[PDB]
Symmetry: D2
Subunit: 483 residues, 4 copies
Amino acid sequence: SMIEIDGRSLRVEDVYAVAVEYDRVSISDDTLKAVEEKHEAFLKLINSGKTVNVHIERDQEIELQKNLIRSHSSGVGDYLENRYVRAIMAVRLNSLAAGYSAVSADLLNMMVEMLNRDVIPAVPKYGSVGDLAPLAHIGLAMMGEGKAFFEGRLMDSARALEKAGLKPYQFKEKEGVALINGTSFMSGILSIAVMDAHDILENAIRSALLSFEALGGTSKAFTPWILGARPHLGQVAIGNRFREYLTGSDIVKRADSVKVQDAYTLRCIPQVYGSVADVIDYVENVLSVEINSATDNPLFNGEEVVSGGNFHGEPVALAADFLAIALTDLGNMVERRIARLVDTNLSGLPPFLTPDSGLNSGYMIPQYTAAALCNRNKVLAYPSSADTIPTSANQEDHVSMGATGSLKLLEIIDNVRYIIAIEYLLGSQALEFTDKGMSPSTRKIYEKIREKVEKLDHDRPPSFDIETIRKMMDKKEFISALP
Amino acid sequence: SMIEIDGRSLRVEDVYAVAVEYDRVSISDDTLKAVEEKHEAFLKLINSGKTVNVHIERDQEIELQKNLIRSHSSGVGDYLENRYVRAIMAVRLNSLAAGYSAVSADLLNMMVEMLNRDVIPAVPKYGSVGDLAPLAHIGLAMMGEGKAFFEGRLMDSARALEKAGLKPYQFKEKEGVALINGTSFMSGILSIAVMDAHDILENAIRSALLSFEALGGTSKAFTPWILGARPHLGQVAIGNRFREYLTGSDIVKRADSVKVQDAYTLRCIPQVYGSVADVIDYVENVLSVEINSATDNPLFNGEEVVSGGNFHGEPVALAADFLAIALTDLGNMVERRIARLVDTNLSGLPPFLTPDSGLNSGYMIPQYTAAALCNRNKVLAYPSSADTIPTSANQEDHVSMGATGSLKLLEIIDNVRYIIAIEYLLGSQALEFTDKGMSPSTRKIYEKIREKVEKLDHDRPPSFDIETIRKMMDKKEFISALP
Amino acid sequence: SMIEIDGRSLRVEDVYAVAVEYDRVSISDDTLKAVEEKHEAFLKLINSGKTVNVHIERDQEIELQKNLIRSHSSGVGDYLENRYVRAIMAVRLNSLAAGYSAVSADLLNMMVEMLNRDVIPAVPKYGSVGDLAPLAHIGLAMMGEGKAFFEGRLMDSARALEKAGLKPYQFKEKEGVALINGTSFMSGILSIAVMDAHDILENAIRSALLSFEALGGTSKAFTPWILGARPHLGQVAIGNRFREYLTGSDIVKRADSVKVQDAYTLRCIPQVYGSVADVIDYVENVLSVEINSATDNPLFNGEEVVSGGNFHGEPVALAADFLAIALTDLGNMVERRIARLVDTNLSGLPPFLTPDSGLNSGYMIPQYTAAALCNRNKVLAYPSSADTIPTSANQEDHVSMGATGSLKLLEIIDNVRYIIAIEYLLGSQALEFTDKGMSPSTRKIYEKIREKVEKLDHDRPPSFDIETIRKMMDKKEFISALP
Amino acid sequence: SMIEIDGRSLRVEDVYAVAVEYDRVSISDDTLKAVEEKHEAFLKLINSGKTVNVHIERDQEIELQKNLIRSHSSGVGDYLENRYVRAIMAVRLNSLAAGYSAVSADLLNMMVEMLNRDVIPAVPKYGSVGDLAPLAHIGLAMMGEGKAFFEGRLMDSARALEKAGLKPYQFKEKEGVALINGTSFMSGILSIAVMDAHDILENAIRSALLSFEALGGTSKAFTPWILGARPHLGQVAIGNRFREYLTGSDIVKRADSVKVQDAYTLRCIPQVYGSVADVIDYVENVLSVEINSATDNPLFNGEEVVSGGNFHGEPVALAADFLAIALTDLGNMVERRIARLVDTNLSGLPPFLTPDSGLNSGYMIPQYTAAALCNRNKVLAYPSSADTIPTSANQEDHVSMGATGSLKLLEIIDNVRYIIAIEYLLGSQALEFTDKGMSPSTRKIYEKIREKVEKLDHDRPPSFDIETIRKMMDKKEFISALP
């Protein structure tokens, strides 16, 4: 489909649509004409200010934009994946169209065409203290220097632009400044991350259904009036989701007739998962403002140019560290439920979910892998925004460090996705030891798993099944299986 | 004054009023009669359930409540300060009155009288994994065992109750369970913490006025349309506060005539401080639900008793870790502004703010102290809720660890308060090297400082002046000086 | 007894003897005469340098030392406990006597008399970035200003000195510089900490004996040739200690006849505890150099005065963070063994170690307390020395942050001591459910516990028994019971 | 060249030689015959034990080894780089030859041929809690299942073995157990890491020479008697290295005539860098024992098979976290020196090292990149070994988490290498603003830089020059330039 950019209407899910699903972007002629008219008012104002040799003056200003793009292109490390650079470019484009950046219509159209033709700059992941260097690398590619991916093939930027039918872009007065000042690296990455955090929670709900039924949990933990006696919006909503999906379970109807309560990895699912949902909503609210905001500097309002601090990443740096914590602890709870599934003394199922403990270990070791992933996430959950280091000869003497936070959030998301893939695998196997009177919803998840991953009889490498299920998650196959 | 408790109307500032300002609490006869009627419905229901020897049965149930209070009284370490135990008791009382805990009117009245007569249990700080043990210690004192403070003097609980004219309380059916299950230790401490976080931000605004004027900052960073181009509510509100307080400054009017922009510790005050305000608001919203919620277990709705997981601390454990991060980074920005004040090459003022660098160090070393405090806060900002350790033979196999988070937030608050006291001290001294054309608002802060702390001429121990200013902050003298 | 100081022979256990056991210090007349002769050579050299008005010159130099002591007295927060300030003073005194500090004999004798008469400066804990401010507070008291404890009573320093029969000390040329530059705050605190870490390991060995016998462990895990197949010195030594102490156990002889192996909290005791012993030895080696080193600045060698960087805390800042980690993980292993003791499915003993699970919880909750303490230690194990913040207008632009690390190590030590007290309590109770055929060594620990703490029948507050056992540990009663 | 393996002589630098420089490994016929004779004694012992149907018994034992390899092959995530898998394989091979693992000569020869023919298993990085899963993946490839790299091309393991002229290996009695139990993943990776940490320190010495001369430092900070007044071995050795390399500097001879002391990033180089050297030596000592130790389980001594805990990673898990901290703080000091170089008020050189601050930013932004890298390292320096999560239904209830620590140490090393590359770049540029009277040693570093990276006149992307210098470091070109 088509995402129209007007500088004020971008949603986080539209950033995803462009970056991950490759929807086209466009900008109306009306928007572009108003952008251009503001760009011209800005030129008139600076041309009057300087005269209170015109040719040497303009050529100097153009050289400045180039020197800035080049000197600031100082990232190191592996290139950021293309889905993230596309997200950053969509957010950057939208925020330059918000009306305060005084850039020209041509700069916006340049970014539109790079996105629609998939000329994606090569952006080293590291260098922003929260985003001059990564955005400079984007501009460097826009100028036809450095490297870029053309339809996923790395090459010199000038060759990628040429294969796409584009000309290198020449930055005008203050357009390099505009492009590289702001929070679009952090906010673009975090837009994708918050969408992937939502997808994590959705998958954790579905994978918990399998474990919850295999362990014969009671629905009493999701009683509406209990959940409403402590009405955080997340836990009320999560309780509703679980009640709906457990409807029709014979296993759970039996449990309700003979069980009072379960261990916390079942009974506390609404409190914990609903906290995670609340944090996701918090971050999405921050981003919803941020990706429609002017975060470059200085800014132009049509009659004056004023320097402020809107490039400072603090609100999104804090949000990235917060969501990292919440997701790490979601992963801890899923790992603990996996640890209960394979422990015959807690589950009431055969040890380690194998039919012959004699010469098989079953799924003993994926639980270690899940614990390993939690331990890695506990390192990564240290808040990068609790630190700051002065830059620019102490003139930029407090910084958010939110780029660190955005990048490590991406790894936590990757790791928690593997933990949940492990719960899909082991919860499906655990149900093989039940009478399978699971709800229709649980059975949709179970059947989708079994389309690609067989039940476990003799030992075989769990790694391959985990990777298959992780690929299914990344293709949204369980959300499709059970809306 | 008087705070009336009805189980549904408690605000965080009312918890503060009771705990810190010693306002009386009361519960209307109407509330108490409805609590008692629900308690009696619960007894009828459990008495009918058991009969589908009455005397031995009831005596057994009473012994159970006692065994629970005693066995769970397993905290270690120093006693929590009385203002916090009072906050916890007010939140506990309100949440047992929310209508689902089936306790008797007498238990609530017991807690009312302990608060109004200042019989405050001795509560070891450590033991909750997020709050059985600390709340058990409260109940232990309520039973007249263990220790308590009577009007601030430590003694055996039975002696404290007797000096207050109270009888030890005997817990009825499920009343010990009700008292010790829930989140009131975390939520009571965090209610006081979020009030103190607000007071921190208020003091940081006032102490920044001194530095901002001494460094001759330009008001251009607070231009309304710039701040509104990125309209996070915090930074818009903070900008308004600073514009109002800088009104009437000759220093700033001059700066605006000759300066374009300042370093980030001045120019980025709205982005960073407004992020902190937003986080404070987030936490207050969580607590506003939590302290009016039923977090004990099982719960009673008038016709059935159901076990759920509302005691699980996750939403407030996450909130405590989040606020710890935001406050640590506020402290980093204040420390960096202090570092600019004493550096003659950044400030344009005499080195280290002494009139004779020859044989004096001036205020060189308080900046080290501020850095030391930041480094301590960077340790404490590690999120305790990213971890979990299984308890109760793996039946309580995921826990929030939010008690850790509440307690370390209190230390961060203490440390940031000292950083701000240091900025009050050094910003006031720095203004001695200006023409003092500061705004009327800044001058109110400056004059309040000078009522108790003299300007620096010859070197003298900064420790004593820092402590004086910290005491003034704790008595709210700068908020009084400048509303 | 008597510790003689000569600037080159101090051991960490001598620092403990002075600071904690109140042994007297002395300095021979020979040492003092050589110190004085070097002080006089230094004066001659600086008096010749300045002359390539003598009265105004010397008076200026004296005023400088005073200004330095006062201006640098900039700590905040609670006063450090007297045992630590005594340790710091003993290390400071020894390191000024090492021969490079050019101080006078009178300064050393001043410190000797403060220690022997117990006039201990009041030292705010916070302010060093790794130790100007805390050592300045010591000097401030030495000058008779600020506050001090006289035989444990806080008062004005001049009054404490007067009650002790001492005169205030007047610092001579470069003597204030000498006193306040160096690492003695970090190294004094860490000398006590490493002694207390050793005492922790010794107590953990003894408390593990109780659990190991109650769980019927097999001695096969301590087989000498197994431990020697991986000959880290710690695990070989720990294995020898456990073999010796388990000699004579009927329980273990039975286990060896029917068991192949135990869970890791028993079988891996040598690997983990021996790693801890190795780290303790590492730190002691660092301190053994450091407390006999010249860490002030500039230094004097008898013919020239040269400025170097020996005050930089890096080797002891790293050591403090390392030992914090090792002790935190020792506490994790003890907590996991406690978690096994109270879980009937792992221990083979009654659930939660109570004789009547019907209406008692036994020792269910001390395991939560141990988990809580581990979670707190996981926050505190963040390495403060991984951070640095520039001080002194960027002239002191990398600092160790080792004071933070020393102080948080003290809390970890306190917390792990409580975890071990909990294992003493619960391992002794667990043996009540065995036939008591424990070794003579284990029985010495068991009997010492039972001298003050009764076995558990009906529920009672574990807090009080934990505190009693912690007090016994602090009085070294189990090391006395079993050498 | 040729590394001969005998189970007891392996050095960390030999692991590097095999893994990184592709030296061949061999095992003498004598070693192999004694390994085989012990394997046969083990078979005799277990065959006698079982008989106190032989065919079904042996076939069962073989199936067990296969089930174990497969079930434990449960890693997730990207494949570990081949240099690390080669290191792990060399350490595993040596430790199985140490004499206690009872494996056959054929298993050792299999590993020898995989290394010498470069058939390197594909090993997912994540899964060990400290190394069943990664070592299982190695064995899986050895069995001809899963994936492997043949001369760097990924393919099915059976195809890689076939292209190399090898047959799949069939694991004999207890040989799969032997292969997958132990610490070789952690210890192999850490052997390469400690070699790369040494190479980091060596490069940091050389890059500091450039900055030290450009800033005109005084050699007084390296005076031998000062450094020996605090004789930690590292700082004495580092001081000697710097004195030797600064010999012949006209710049430094001038500085010594007019300067007393420098800022800490120059004056404290011996204290900090020597601490790092000491930590490196500590880790190398641990590894020197560990890679020659029997860490599998159970172990065989020729007459009995006994289960112990030598697989527990604690000593190397702690060492990996320790070295991570020390290297992070080395990176902080290098970043602070970079921050001094580009600040004209600290350096005395043109702002940001550009000849025309008018329209150029010079090397302003690489300092941000260095700060960004430090902030990332501060996250990664959180100690993974402070945490533990129970595995295997609580039977493996304390684990080292040292695999996490080894992997994140590799990233810290990568990041610090970039920081040092930045100092090479900017220190060389800074010398362009001096009279170049640098020492012959410094000039060797400067000239080697200038062979590939030109001085900066007009702004250009620093990223490319940083990457070039990082590649030069990885090819050891500065150690070659200046031994």
